[PDB]
Structures are given as structure tokens and as C-alpha cells.
Structure 1
Amino acid sequence: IPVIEPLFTKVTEDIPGAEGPVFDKNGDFYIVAPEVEVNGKPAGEILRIDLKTGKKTVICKPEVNGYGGIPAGCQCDRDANQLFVADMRLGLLVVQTDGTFEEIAKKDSEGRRMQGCNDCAFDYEGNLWITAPAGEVAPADYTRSMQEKFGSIYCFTTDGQMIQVDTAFQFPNGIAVRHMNDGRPYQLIVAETPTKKLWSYDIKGPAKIENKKVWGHIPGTHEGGADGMDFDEDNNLLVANYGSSHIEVFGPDGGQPKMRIRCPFEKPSNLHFKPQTKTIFVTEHENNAVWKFEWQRNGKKQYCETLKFGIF
């Protein structure tokens, strides 16, 4: 498999469990620090990074009734410049730029208690597909599906429904949505970390997925596997292979990677493209840092980059 070795340039450092990189509607950059702790208890943070200086500013330190969150993944909204954040303890959060936030769901559409989330992906229809590898949200005792298959998948719809669309995953992690050229959402890709698998589903409509399939295979037998993921403008899927020192590049049809990207570290965690560029910001756990490198092309536009009142 072809492997490229692009220059990785340092962005920022010392962010415990550096995760969920995201750009907002203003082009501002954000990173989540799920692993920040205060006396052994979770006290996760959501930070804004000044790309010019690399200086950090924590805008939000989410906690509900004394229970600190473990913010792990982000997506920027389109109709409002707010961030939807997958939290391993609090579920789904909506965080404002001023640092204020709200807890979206205690329970799903079936009245079942909400599970802690890790990552999420907005489709062009505005529906948010979320991976839920943790057990029930706080106040429940923290649990994660690294060993047992109780990880779930949710779809938070435009009409405000938190619908569990699937479950029985062994740590569902990264997630991405494939769209047709006309903008129609038609395939969901879900990373199941320890099993070294990328699963796919046909999106038949909002909160409606069918035909679960093993879409791709993540290289290596190291501890870890597929973490964060995103598509480039040609629909190639770049997946951070935690523990392999590489970001895998799958073609539109999946299977085995068609190329790998060597990182100057062992634990790439998540990645995100800078709008209108080929620049991919990469978070990694070895140094709890953020880097950036130039990919072959621009990234696929995130939902936040689309236009509600767009003519074409």
C-alpha cells in the first residue's frame, strides 16, 4: 500500500486527550480535552485555539449537577454558529462560542436513558449521526464498550428526536456520512475501534439506516484502531488509525486502504480539514497535541459550510 510522508507542523500542545478538532462558521478552531481531571473526577474541556500563536483558551468546562463531562467529538452547526459536542458522560451537548452550553438529552425517543457519546457527523439534511461507545450518561457509573458490545449509534434529527438507530458495537468511534453529488445523504460509515472494522449503512432517510456491512478493514493488530474520520472532496475517507502511526486513506468503495499517511507519532486520534484548503489538523494522544499537514486535495464540505438559502 502506497504511503506518503507529508510534513507535520505543530499547532498546539498539552491538551489532555486532544480530540474533536473542528472549525466554526467564522473559521475559528476548536479542540476538546476529554481527559482533563480534577481530583480523579472528569472535568473535560472545550478549547479555542489561536492558530496564529497556538495559544489556548478554554471556553467551556461542561458539568451537569456536579458531574464533569468528557467532551470527545465536535461538529459545527449551519443555521447557528454553535458546536454540537459528543460527551462520554453527558451525551450530546450544544456549546455556544461564549462558553455556555445545554444538555440535549437525558433519554432517547424510546424513553431509554441516554448513553455517553464520542463523535458525531452532520449530514447535509441537518441530521446528526452520533456514536455512543460509553454506557448510560451521568449520574450513572461510567462505562465504555471497549470489551463488551453495548456501544450504540444515534441520530439526532432536525425535529429534535434522539433516535437510537443501532447498538451492539464494541466501541463505535469515528463516524462520517457519504453524500451523492447533488447533496443527498446515502451512506453512513462507523468505526468500531478494537475490531479493526469500518461499518457502513445505507441511509434511507432521517434516522433510517439499513444494510449494515463491514465496509473497510483497518491495518494492524496493535491496541487501538479506527478513531476519527472525515471525507476529502473526492469522497476518499481518511481515518486516524490510533496506535498505528498512520491515517488510513480508503477509496469510495472501501475494503483495504489505497494509501496510508505516516504521522510523526503513534496515536493519531482525530482529524479535520480547514475549510477551503487541503490542510488537515490532526490530534494525537502520545503528546496530547495538535498538528497540521497538507493532504492531496480539499476536504468534503462539512454541513456548517453549506448554505440553507443556497441556489445551487
Structure 2
Amino acid sequence: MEIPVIEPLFTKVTEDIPGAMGPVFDKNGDFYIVAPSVEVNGKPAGEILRIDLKTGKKTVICKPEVNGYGGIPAGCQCDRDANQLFVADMRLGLLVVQTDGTFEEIAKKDSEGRRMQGCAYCAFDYEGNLWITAPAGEVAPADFTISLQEKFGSIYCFTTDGQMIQVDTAFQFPAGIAVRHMNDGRPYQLIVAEQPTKKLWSYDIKGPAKIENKKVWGHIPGTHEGGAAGMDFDEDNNLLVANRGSSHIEVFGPKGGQPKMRIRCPFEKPSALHFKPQTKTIFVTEHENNAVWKFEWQRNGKKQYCETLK
């Protein structure tokens, strides 16, 4: 058989967002993206922005930097118990950003005393633990490096009790990350994209920062330069995966394998994606035009941690 391919209408939401990624909705329904690639004087100066979904205007909420080193904010999730954004930053590690612009760096070292690595994507499980991919080398002031070729990318779990625990390493550019939950809400599997290898990895989640049974979960089509980037589950736990460089978003069933459907994009490099809460609308960033798009999926997205109730 061939993989069915659909061609939904993509509508441009905003543009001129360098390296646009990290689409996220906060608890008030406000929409945010990050511009990791913004530079000043040739040095990093990424931004976290709020987008008015009516006009498309941009508002810089945060231009994070620590001891003079600019951040590269790259992925976002909204907290449940407070309206604050957890932001994976490729130079600063993990941040917590408020709507007023104040931010704090969560960790310069991990639970074992190793220097933190720069982070790219993150995902809350329903227990409130934050699973994080770290494809970059060590955080500032170390020189910025990325695991495009060498296998030094890592996975972290920022637990509810405040521990930054490295749970695996030796990935080649770990990117998108998502949590597959059971019907009752228990975390079941952690899904991790390894971009250049065209693989999706899964672990069984046994508890906070406790993952086992590591194995290949899905195969990403194509031999283009690129592979799986951002990802998110729909309400049936179908996993939608930006396949950067393929002009497609892949759709996997809950159990992985090969994509059961592909979504053709009007651009080559989808980078991240995020459902709008309580809708079928998927917002998609792409690095061909540095723009944000939206399209309508077949069903609503899976509730993010920030939508759940205690």
C-alpha cells in the first residue's frame, strides 16, 4: 500500500519570525511563539512573542539573557497551576517565563552535577513532570554546539519536586517530544523524535523521571535532509509529526509504526506544531518563510497539561 495523503487548507497567521518555533497557548487562550534565530551584533538574542490572532501583530514578551549571554528560546509549554510558560532554551537550558516578561533560569546543572545542556522541545505529562529534549551541548558560557552529527543529545525530566534529571543521552539531535497517556490519565509512553535518523523513539513511563523499555516507535518517511521536528497528539492519541524538509506532517496511530496518513504542507520545512485548545485547529511554524500557519485537523487535540484540572 501507499500512505494516504490529504491536502487541507493552510492559512498564514503571522510572518517574519526568525526560526519560528514554540507555538503555545496560555491559560487565557493567548498565543505565543518563539524566534530562536534573532541575533544582534552576530550574537544570540532570541525572543518570546505574543501574537494577536486577529491582526497578526507581534509583541515581544521576553528577550531572555543571563550574565550577558542571550537565549535561544525554542519550545514552550504552559503550566497548569499558574499562567506561566516553561521554555526550552538552547543556550540557557530551561526557563520559566511570566506574561510580564520576568523570567528565571531553572538549572545551571542537573541532578548529578553535570552542566546543563541547551534544550529544544518539552512536554508536560498529566502528573506535572516536564520531559525535555536537549540537542545542544552545554549551556552558556560554553560555545553553542548541536548534535547534528555527534550523539551527545540528551533527554531530561524536570520533576514536580524540582529535580532536573538527565534520563537518557547519546541522541543525534533529539527534537520533538510528547507523552502518550492512558484513558484514565496515567502517563504511558514518552515519544522522542531523533531528527536526522528518521526515527521516533518511545519509552514506557514508570513514574517521575523513570523511563524503561526504550525502542524504536515509528519510522519517518524520506531521505531528505531533516526528519521529525515538533509533534503533538490529537484526542485519539494519533501523533502528528512535523517532518522538516519533506513538505509533510506525518500522522501516526497510537501504537506507532509507519505513518497511517500524511498531510501535505504548502512549504518544505514544518518545524513545530500545537493544537489550539478545545479545537481541531493546528498551528504550524515553518522555517522556509519564518511564518506561522494554521489548518483544520479531523478532530480536537489532546488536552495539554495546562487544560487539565486537579
- Following TM superposition, by how much is the alpha carbon of 1:50 offset from its aligned partner in structure 2, in angstroms? 0.2
Distance 1:214 1:164 in 2: 20
Q: What is the deviation of 1:186?
A: 1.1
Query: 1:253 deviation in Å?
Result: 1.1
Structure 2 CA distance for aligned equivalents of residues 205 and 276 of structure 1: 27
Looking at structure 1, the residues matched to 21 and 164 of structure 2 have their Cα atoms a distance apart, in angstroms, of 23
Which stretches of structure 1, 4 residues or longer, exceed 6 Å deviation after superposition?
none
Q: What SS class does the counterpart of residue 89 from structure 1 fall into?
A: coil
- CA deviation profile, 1:84-123 (whole Å, cap 9, x unmatched): 0000000000000011100000000001100000000000
1:16-75 superposed Cα distances (whole Å, 9 cap, x missing partner): 000010000000000000000001100000000000100000110000011000000000
Structure 1: distance between partners of 2:170 and 2:154: 6
Among 246, 253, 268, the alignment partner of 1:266 is 268
**Could you tell me how far 1:243 is from its partner in structure 2?**
0.3
Q: For 2:179, what is the secondary structure of its paired residue?
A: strand
Match for residue 240 of structure 1?
242
Q: Counterpart of 2:11?
A: 9
Q: Distance in 2 between matches of 1:293 and 1:20?
A: 17
Partner of 1:26: 28
Distance (Å, rounded) in 1 between the aligned partners of 2:15 and 2:143 = 31
SS of corresponding position for 2:306: helix
Could you report, residue by residue, the CA deviation over 1:224-276 in whole angstroms, capped at 9, with x for unpaired residues? 10000000000000000000000000011111000000000000000000111
Alignment RMSD (CA, Å): 0.4
**Shift, 1:4, TM fit:** 0.5
Q: Partners of 1:183 and 1:234 in 2: how far apart?
A: 13
Percent identity of equivalent pairs: 96
The CA distance in 2 between the partners of 1:215 and 1:39, in whole Å, is: 42
Following superposition, the deviation at residue 161 of structure 1 comes to 0.1
Offset at residue 132 of structure 1 (A): 0.4
Q: CA deviation at 1:291?
A: 0.4
Out of 170, 173, 177, which is 1:171 matched to? 173
Q: How many residues align?
A: 308
Does the residue aligned with 2:104 lie in a helix, a strand or coil?
strand
**Whole-angstrom CA distance in 2 between matches of 1:66 and 1:253:** 45
Secondary structure of the 1:226 match is strand
Q: Name the SS of the counterpart of 1:107 in structure 2.
A: coil
Task: State the shift of 1:302 in Å.
Answer: 0.2
Aligned to 2:150: 148
> Tell me, what secondary structure is at the counterpart of 1:54?
coil
1:186-205 matched pairs, under 5 angstroms: 186-205=188-207
Q: State the Cα distance separating 1:136 from its structure 2 match.
A: 0.4
**Displacement of 1:296:** 0.3
SS at match of 1:304: helix
Q: Give the C-alpha shift of residue 200 in structure 1.
A: 0.1
CA deviation vs aligned residue, 1:182-236 (integer Å, no higher than 9, x gap): 0000100000000000000000111000011000000111111000000000000
Equivalence for 1:182: 184
Q: TM-score, normalised by structure 2?
A: 0.99
Match of 1:123 in 2: 125
**Distance in 2 separating the partners of 1:76 and 1:203:** 21
Task: Give the aligned partner of residue 275 of structure 1.
Answer: 277
In structure 1, C-alpha distance between the alignment counterparts of 2:166 and 2:90, rounded to whole Å: 16
Unaligned residue ranges in structure 2 (runs of 5+): none
Distance 1:58 1:222 in 2: 34
